């Protein structure tokens, strides 16, 4: 979700500004079979 689409459709840049509105997490990227964005 959120731009993770898998291995093949990765929208990185989506994940990671979904991930910083989730005020503290730092960033986030498309992780763990390419489905979930994995913020941190």
Request: charged share 25%; proline share 0%.
């Given at each position: 979700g959120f731009g993770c689409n898998g291995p093949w459709d990765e929208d990185d840049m989506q994940c990671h500004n979904h991930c910083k509105s989730?005020?503290?997490?730092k960033g986030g990227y498309c992780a763990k079979g390419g489905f979930v964005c994995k913020c941190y």
């Open positions: 989730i005020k503290g997490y």
